[PDB]
């Protein structure tokens, strides 16, 4: 039912559903089988940053994920998002653990959407999330804590990522991400994250996603479905 | 019930409830009887611009309303808004006609809210409103048209401001307008408007306002209550 | 000597040096023979808008030029600008008339450059230029007038574009347009222009360009060299 | 000769020239004897943040300096800066040691200037300074290092603040800080700093300042003159 576009930070290779056999970042257009991926060295316990960039001129959706040591992974995909997304969307962040697990801590998240004609703009920046974050819609296991973080997946009292968890935070306001009369419709989103695991292998990752506004966590979408898709089609 | 802070562009002098005997801009803190006003020459049928500026450092809320010929009216009031507003608010625009009437056309509206610590930010800009504006909450008579305008009060098919009308548009997302740990909590809001009247005297004006998030149009708040207050206390 | 990257709004087809046989927008990398162009219907006497967008992730430089009736022309080119431009640049606007002529009036110009690490940012917006614009470097025939415009090419007292004219306005501050440790280095530039001609055919166009900081108008670079190149190589 | 407006972070009480007998932040209008000050607990070796905020509506210039533990000091002064500053200015940061000394390390500096009519804007952000910072004008002892810092006063190879030092960094581009037709002319500037001393008492402080564009370090303006004034008048 939901239309999803997403950038996934995919920590766990689900080879039987498309993933490459490494941790990877992915552009996902209406399917968890990414249209495009890049090998990504997730750095356990380090604070990472994702940048997602799209404009309707170049019609190239790009993401880059880096860490402070400067290793960074980048992915791009040429796609006309006007053809994919409804005019109004919500934007958000999504995370999963499955059998294997990890902290899916967002430390900051920012987003800018513009429509420039022949301008409407939405921008939010969160560098600190709060306990009762009234412009965020939390779903599933996502919590904002007093440590100023967005914890997208269940952590246990004593600091531990719980498995089978799925959580999302959508910004409260619909965003008008395209308008057929706009000459430029662009969006940028940036988030920093801390994936930490003690697990044999971390899983399952974090995605920034854009969806129809009424979007919600799909049924059994934990683990490899990254809280975005009802299935692996 | 609602806590209101507002800048009013008050086209019609309701002297029996505080107004001065001229059209005026006003800062309103929890009462339609402005704490501070300035004589304002509303220019009939011309596009005007309001700017509202507040920061928690100076703790001075200011507005200036100007037109293109450069006549402008300005008002300031020293007030600690942390003491007035709940932490989370909605922001919006409100308009009224009563016995006398006017177009209450908003052509653009922009808003920036920041919390800077020892940053969270929301910014929206509308330069064009659309028929189905999913990040706006319209109340009462407010409509967004295909002419890209926000028509806060009922206009009649043939271009005429109807009386007894009250309408508001709140931005969809709550805004976090103060946070006791922020060192600067500031907001700016800007809107352009076109008040046009054929009436013996225009009424009643436009306000930018900030309220509790669940705020709605008070009972019988048309005319001089500018769609903000249940009474004239 | 100068390294140029530019988006040209090329009103006059110089077929013997690469142009297509129509008015065109072009991406120019170190040569006036554009790497990529798109047919552009210049609308005589109408206010146009150019948007130039680049980020080091997608590594796609794009421009779109539109007018209010919504006709718009778009061009994109995949290029790694880190390989082309020195780290510090100036940004600007350039215009030419030759044998044929036109007003090369810039009504507004804005620019945003960011370096985001694993942020530095410059943004300027001019919606009104002034007589003595101390953050602009004017070259050749470019003048800022009291009408708030940037007139890149000589106009005659009585409203007429003079021929053989070349003029540029560079923003005063060097911009740091790439930094090998930045994970995103992006820039956007936007300008509105009014090309007006009574001439048999308008010429020669407007470019937004990025150059080494000490860049100046090349010798005899009027007409088809758009004030950017010493020759047509 | 120079016209200065400044916010001083004054670490050393020069009581014989106006200072209070504590470390203080100060608003300085054309004189080092601040028009207004507030006791400021400089936290030795900690990273501090200054915010300076002015708009021509409220006509209140404010600064707040805080540290991470949240102690913050605030100062405001009602002043019409149109009456004080020339239309075009440069903006910058200034520091001094005298007999007593301190590191005057700027870790980031940002500035936004707007003119809104009846908009021109300049914004720069430096979160990382570089060795050869081509949009900064360094004066006296100010150096940008490879550690990404702006070191306004001489530090010695082995980490030590040298005395008698004075250094400033002005942004390269003049800023148009007022325009008599603007209805709002506002500016915000933000900088983080690290003042560290081993000295019996730290001195002399950091100022953000705005000056005529050709401004330079006054003769013998080390120590208590904070690199802004030729004398203590
Ligand atoms: O449901 C099995 C899935 O759970 C994840 O945590 C594992 O890594 C695997 O993708
Ligand atoms: O209800 C009477 C009120 O209606 C307004 O339109 C008049 O100007 C007056 O304030
Ligand atoms: O120098 C000849 C050139 O001058 C331009 O104005 C003409 O259109 C042609 O490109
Ligand atoms: O020149 C004497 C001054 O030098 C400063 O470092 C001292 O604190 C005092 O203000
Ligand atoms: Ca996977
Ligand atoms: Ca009234
Ligand atoms: Ca040509
Ligand atoms: Ca002192
Ligand atoms: Mn995947
Ligand atoms: Mn009133
Ligand atoms: Mn060409
Ligand atoms: Mn002092």
Which residues on neighbouring strands pair with residue C192, listed in sequence order?
C49, C108
**Given phi > 0 = left and psi -120 to 50 = alpha, else beta, which region is B181?**
alpha
* Tokens describing residue C158: 């009585």
* Tokens describing residue B154: 């009922």
* Tokens describing residue A121: 């703009």
Question: What residues contact B125, with CB distance under 8 A and at least 6 apart?
Answer: A119, A120, A121, B108, B109, B110, B111
DSSP 3-state of C17: helix
Q: Which residue's structure tokens are 């690199």?
A: D227
Q: Please, are residues D14 and D32 in contact by the beta-carbon 8 Å criterion?
A: no
* Tokens describing residue C25: 């927008």
In angstroms, rounded to a whole number, what is the distance separating the alpha carbons of residues A95 and A197? 14
Q: What is the distance in A from the centroid of ligand 7 to the CA of C228?
A: 12
In angstroms, rounded to a whole number, what is the distance separating the alpha carbons of residues C46 and C67? 7
Query: Which other chains touch chain B, taking contact as 3+ CB pairs less than 8 Å apart?
Result: A, D
Question: What residues contact A147, with CB distance under 8 A and at least 6 apart?
Answer: none
Q: Which residue's structure tokens are 């500053």?
A: D85
In angstroms, rounded to a whole number, what is the distance separating the alpha carbons of residues A225 and A166? 9
Nearest CA to ligand 4 atom 4: D98
Nearest to A86 by CA among A4, A158, A170: A4
Which residues on neighbouring strands pair with residue C91, listed in sequence order?
C210
DSSP state of C99: S
Nearest to B171 by CA among B184, B153, B189: B189
* Tokens describing residue A112: 């800018």
Q: Please, are residues B204 and B227 in contact by the beta-carbon 8 Å criterion?
A: no
CA distances from D217 to D139, D165, D213, D233 (A): 7, 11, 12, 16
Q: Please, are residues B86 and B80 in contact by the beta-carbon 8 Å criterion?
A: no
In angstroms, rounded to a whole number, what is the distance separating the alpha carbons of residues D107 and D230? 27
Beta strand pairing call for D36-39 and D47-55? unpaired
Nearest to B7 by CA among B28, B24, B22, B21: B28
Q: Please, are residues C56 and C182 in contact by the beta-carbon 8 Å criterion?
A: yes
Q: Apex CA A93: angle with CA A91 and CA A97, to 5°?
A: 150
In angstroms, rounded to a whole number, what is the distance separating the alpha carbons of residues B81 and B176? 12
Cβ contact (<8 Å) for C57 and A58? Answer: no
First to last CA, chain A: 13
Beta strand pairing call for A175-176 and A88-96? antiparallel
Burial of B16 (0-12, 13-18, 19+ CB in 10 A): exposed
Q: Please, are residues D20 and D13 in contact by the beta-carbon 8 Å criterion?
A: yes
In angstroms, rounded to a whole number, what is the distance separating the alpha carbons of residues C223 and C232? 11
Q: Please, are residues A137 and A170 in contact by the beta-carbon 8 Å criterion?
A: yes
In angstroms, rounded to a whole number, what is the distance separating the alpha carbons of residues C188 and C191? 10
Cis peptide before C158 (omega within 30 of 0): no
Q: Please, are residues B26 and B37 in contact by the beta-carbon 8 Å criterion?
A: yes
Which of C14, C20, C163, C197 has the most ligand 3 atoms within 8 A of CB, as the residue to mutate?
A: C14
Contacts of B186 in chain D (CB under 8 A): 53
DSSP state of B154: P
Q: Please, are residues C38 and C12 in contact by the beta-carbon 8 Å criterion?
A: no
CA distances from B93 to B103, B193, D7, D125 (A): 14, 11, 36, 32
Which residues on neighbouring strands pair with residue B6, listed in sequence order?
B28, B209
Q: What is the distance in A from the centroid of ligand 8 to the CA of D25?
A: 10
E strand residue ranges, A59-183: 60-66, 72-78, 88-96, 105-116, 120-126, 136-140, 143-144, 150-151, 155-156, 160-161, 166-171, 175-176
In angstroms, rounded to a whole number, what is the distance separating the alpha carbons of residues A152 and A150? 6
D175 touches chain C (CB under 8 A): yes
Q: Which residue's structure tokens are 């605030």?
A: D74
Nearest to B38 by CA among B16, B55, B57, B22: B22
D183 touches chain C (CB under 8 A): no
Residue C199 phi/psi, 5° resolution?
A: -45, 145
Q: Please, are residues A82 and A56 in contact by the beta-carbon 8 Å criterion?
A: yes
In angstroms, rounded to a whole number, what is the distance separating the alpha carbons of residues B187 and B175? 10
Residue A64 phi/psi, 5° resolution?
A: -135, 135
Nearest to D182 by CA among B49, B90, A207, A154: B49
Burial of B89 (0-12, 13-18, 19+ CB in 10 A): buried
* Tokens describing residue C93: 């606007």
In angstroms, rounded to a whole number, what is the distance separating the alpha carbons of residues C73 and C43? 12
* Tokens describing residue D200: 């019996």
In angstroms, rounded to a whole number, what is the distance separating the alpha carbons of residues C221 and B59? 55
DSSP state of A154: P
In angstroms, rounded to a whole number, what is the distance separating the alpha carbons of residues A197 and A145? 19
In angstroms, rounded to a whole number, what is the distance separating the alpha carbons of residues A204 and A101? 7
In angstroms, rounded to a whole number, what is the distance separating the alpha carbons of residues C21 and C14? 7
Q: Determine the number of helices (DSSP H) and then strands (DSSP E) in chain D.
A: 0, 18
In angstroms, rounded to a whole number, what is the distance separating the alpha carbons of residues B148 and C66? 19
Residue B160 burial (CB count, 10 A): 15
The CATH number given to whatever domain includes residue D26 is 2.60.120.200
* Tokens describing residue A194: 């801390």
Q: Please, are residues A12 and A23 in contact by the beta-carbon 8 Å criterion?
A: yes
CA distances from D40 to C91, D200, D205 (A): 42, 18, 11
* Tokens describing residue D24: 């203080």
CA distances from D70 to A72, D123, D150 (A): 34, 27, 24
Contacts of A76 in chain C (CB under 8 A): 57-59
Total domains present in chain C: 1
- Ligand nearest to C-alpha C36: 11
Domain interval for residue D181: 1-233
E strand residue ranges, chain A: 4-10, 24-29, 36-39, 47-55, 60-66, 72-78, 88-96, 105-116, 120-126, 136-140, 143-144, 150-151, 155-156, 160-161, 166-171, 175-176, 184-194, 205-211
**Given phi > 0 = left and psi -120 to 50 = alpha, else beta, which region is B93?**
beta
Q: Please, are residues A120 and A114 in contact by the beta-carbon 8 Å criterion?
A: yes
Q: Please, are residues B63 and B52 in contact by the beta-carbon 8 Å criterion?
A: yes
CA B121 to chain centre: 21
In angstroms, rounded to a whole number, what is the distance separating the alpha carbons of residues A179 and A189? 19
Q: Which residue's structure tokens are 């810092």?
A: D149
Q: Please, are residues A163 and A154 in contact by the beta-carbon 8 Å criterion?
A: no
Q: Please, are residues C110 and C190 in contact by the beta-carbon 8 Å criterion?
A: yes
Q: Apex CA D85: angle with CA D84 and CA D91, to 5°?
A: 135
Nearest to A12 by CA among A223, A173, A230, A231: A223
Can you give the resolution of this entry in Å?
2.2
C123 touches chain A (CB under 8 A): no
Ion ligand 8 contact residues with beta carbon within 5 A: D 10, 12, 14, 19, 224
In angstroms, rounded to a whole number, what is the distance separating the alpha carbons of residues B185 and B56? 5
In angstroms, rounded to a whole number, what is the distance separating the alpha carbons of residues A124 and B114? 10
In angstroms, rounded to a whole number, what is the distance separating the alpha carbons of residues D103 and B141? 61
Nearest to D181 by CA among B103, B68, B145: B68
Residue C171 burial (CB count, 10 A): 25
Q: Please, are residues A213 and A10 in contact by the beta-carbon 8 Å criterion?
A: no
D110 touches chain B (CB under 8 A): no
Q: Are C and A close enough to touch, i.e. 3+ CB pairs under 8 angstroms?
A: yes
Torsion over CA of B146, B149, B152 and B154, rounded to 10 degrees?
Answer: -50
Q: Please, are residues B57 and D64 in contact by the beta-carbon 8 Å criterion?
A: yes
In angstroms, rounded to a whole number, what is the distance separating the alpha carbons of residues B73 and A94? 48
Q: Please, are residues D145 and D129 in contact by the beta-carbon 8 Å criterion?
A: yes
CA D125 to chain centre: 15
């Amino acid at each position: 039912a939901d239309t999803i576009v997403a950038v996934e930070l995919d920590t766990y290779p689900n080879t039987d559903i498309g993933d490459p056999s490494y941790p990877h970042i992915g552009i996902d257009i209406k399917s968890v089988r990414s249209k495009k991926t890049a090998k990504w060295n997730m750095q356990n316990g380090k604070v990472g940053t994702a940048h997602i960039i799209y404009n309707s001129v170049g019609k190239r959706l790009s993401a880059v994920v880096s860490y402070p040591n400067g290793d960074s992974a980048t992915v791009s995909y040429d796609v006309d998002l006007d053809n994919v997304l409804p005019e109004w969307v919500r934007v958000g962040l999504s995370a999963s653990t499955g059998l294997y697990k990890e902290t899916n801590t967002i430390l900051s998240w920012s987003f800018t959407s513009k429509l420039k004609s022949n301008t409407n703009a939405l921008h939010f920046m969160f560098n600190q999330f709060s306990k009762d974050q009234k412009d965020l819609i939390l779903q599933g296991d996502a919590t904002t804590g007093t440590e100023g973080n967005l914890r997208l997946t269940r952590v246990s009292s004593n600091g531990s990522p719980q498995g089978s968890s799925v959580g999302r935070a959508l910004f409260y306001a619909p965003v008008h991400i395209w308008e057929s009369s706009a000459v430029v419709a662009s969006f940028e989103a940036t988030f920093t994250f801390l994936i930490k695991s003690p697990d044999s292998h971390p899983a399952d990752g974090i995605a920034f996603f854009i969806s129809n506004i009424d979007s919600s966590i799909p049924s059994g979408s934990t683990g490899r479905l990254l809280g975005l898709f009802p299935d692996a089609n």
